Design a protein around this ligand. Structure first.
Ligand SMILES: CCCCCCCCCCCCCC(=O)O
Ligand SMILES: CCCCCCCCCCCCCC(=O)O
Lengths: 363, 363
């Protein structure tokens, strides 16, 4: 009878732009070994990141000494809150603005992050400051990683199709900068070169199938998941005494290489399509190997997913948020004379799990 | 067209029973003051708890010294994992056992906890060890507190009604014992006297309304939420360097007193019933003030919610899990000759939010 649709959308990020050249220079200062300082310069170079938005400054000496201290986890969580509320309120609002709905119509808020833990959290502030119904259904989704926006979209899809008349509001926000530390190990150095801050927001609504939908609407055709074997170590998320971390496996790129195509293939098979029918590839911009290996698993030229590279270059990895950016860019660039430019988004989660969705943008 | 139903259900807990008399004695030893040692004895007495199940021992001197140490948060999270996987796997299985369905029918797993953070986490192990489809949709719900099973049920309700043919599996597990510490403050002493360990599991399925449903089925009539004003401080959840905490306000009981009736009233009004039509009150057994004040807000004798007191007495507060226990007891005790014994469950979440549901048990 029915099918889900993105009716509004928006993005935001901390004002502070941080040039990768500076970050690399600032980090290189610290190591002062011939091999060590060299290794670091090389790592930052390979990231394909020009800038990241960061709510906390790596410039301030006052923040420097705090980052050194042990047992600060709780202060960082409060700091996530202190910076996230205005950002998330602002972006949620912008997603709702220019829509013809009463707040009474907004029946779900799915809040998403893997970079702060605190309750009552940001989700409550969204409903208070935006004036959403206090009877709103809420779901807080945590530690589902870079791919968490797919899990959130899937959840909102189920809401609006089960309650046609109502809308679902999804908000993702990630403040990696809040969890920044000094490098105990190689993985610390790598992680701290990639992750940035950002938030994104989506309003989802139902639709009777074969309605003349608005232009700019994105239709959630289908969603998909695959939990993989032999790749528990791929993406790991933890809570340390001095911050939340993500620990990546050296083998993650080959995990991704071996898993992307068959998963995406099977999805297309069950949807009755081919790589030929896909105009857009919203590969999560987690890093250069993540895009490269996704693309080389599929049959596609690396640089085809141009929005993914663009977002990585400008923002870095904003975990769950990145794919919202990718999608907003894709809606902006009407790159075809076709009525529906259709695409596939996917990302990777601890498991390893491949999460994604097929969608048609209504031009 | 349709409405949701609980088709299977199960509970479990750490083997180790801890008598409150011992716990109180063990904790009283630690303070050596006339007022101090006295105050503590009084607190434990007031809890209305005989026993709690605990995955970690308060007996072992080896565990004693670890509980003292700072910055152990990450080890505790791994410890949550080490103990949660078998429990959660076992209970999820038992919820599924004695059911006709193939694993291909299980399309959602909503995993719930506010007492450990780790990825890849327990949810992945449920699908691996239970052999559930790897294409299963997952949602991990964290820090939604004692009431999180209502948020999870609601979410599963939306899944099965949006995908009639499939089932949703909900698993809640809470291991407070993992987060145990030495008391920095009065609230630490109070918290450590109430919270225990437990898990529960639910299989939810769809149904065409006016089907002769099975006996023992519980029908999710409706769910409800209310985010309150001026009660941010009521229930607070945080992540410290040496464990996750919950900080309760002295005013929480009056927050509950002032909010339960109008919220529950309005729900009944929108469902067209009265307190008269409610045969069962599944008040979250968070503590004696929580039940007492809920009951005195509503028009009901305190001791009416007998399952709530029973569960508190035997297990303590197992946050999200407790209401599953309450419901399992209620299904067990067929207390009426009526065909449908109907009830209301609710609980309290950081916000403060009142979350709950109306249900008819098909007897
Ligand atoms: C999913 C958890 C993400 C954990 C983030 C830890 C790393 C934060 C990196 C923030 C950028 C800091 C770079 C710098 O030191 O200049
Ligand atoms: C939602 C977070 C709850 C944090 C719970 C921390 C304390 C749990 C108490 C476990 C019982 C410890 C035994 C005792 O000292 O009596």
């Amino acid at each position: 009878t029915t099918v889900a649709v993105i009716e509004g959308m928006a993005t935001g990020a901390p004002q502070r732009v941080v040039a990768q050249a500076d970050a690399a220079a600032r980090v290189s200062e610290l190591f002062v070994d011939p091999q060590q300082r060299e290794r670091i310069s090389r790592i930052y170079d390979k990231t394909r990141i020009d800038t990241r938005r960061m709510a906390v400054d790596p410039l301030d000496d006052e923040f420097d000494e705090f980052r050194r201290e042990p047992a600060t986890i709780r202060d960082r969580m409060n700091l996530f809150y202190q910076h996230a509320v205005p950002l998330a309120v602002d972006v949620a609002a912008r997603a709702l603005d220019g829509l013809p709905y009463a707040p009474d119509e907004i029946g779900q808020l799915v809040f998403v992050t893997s970079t702060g833990f605190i309750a009552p959290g940001v989700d409550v502030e969204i409903v208070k400051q935006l004036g959403l119904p206090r009877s709103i259904s809420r779901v807080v989704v945590n530690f589902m990683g870079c791919a968490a926006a797919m899990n959130a979209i899937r959840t909102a899809t189920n809401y609006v199709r089960a309650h046609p008349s109502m809308k679902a509001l999804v908000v993702c926000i990630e403040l990696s900068s809040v969890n920044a530390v000094f490098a105990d190990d190689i993985n610390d150095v790598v992680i701290h070169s990639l992750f940035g801050d950002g938030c994104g927001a989506l309003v989802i609504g139902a639709s009777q199938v074969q309605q003349p939908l608005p232009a700019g609407n994105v239709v959630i055709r289908s969603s998909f998941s695959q939990l993989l074997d032999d790749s528990e170590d791929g993406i790991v998320l933890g809570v340390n005494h001095d911050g939340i971390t993500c620990e990546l496996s050296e083998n993650l790129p080959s995990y991704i290489y071996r898993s992307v195509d068959p998963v995406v293939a099977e999805m297309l098979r069950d949807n009755g399509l081919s790589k030929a029918d896909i105009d857009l590839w919203a590969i999560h911009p987690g890093g250069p190997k993540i895009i490269e290996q996704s693309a080389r698993s599929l049959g596609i030229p690396v640089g085809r997913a141009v929005q993914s590279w663009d977002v990585l270059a400008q923002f870095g990895n904003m975990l769950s948020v990145s794919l919202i950016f990718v999608l907003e860019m894709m809606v902006a660039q009407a790159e075809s004379d076709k009525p529906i430019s259709t695409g596939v988004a996917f990302a990777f989660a601890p498991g390893v799990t491949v999460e994604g969705m097929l969608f048609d943008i209504i031009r």
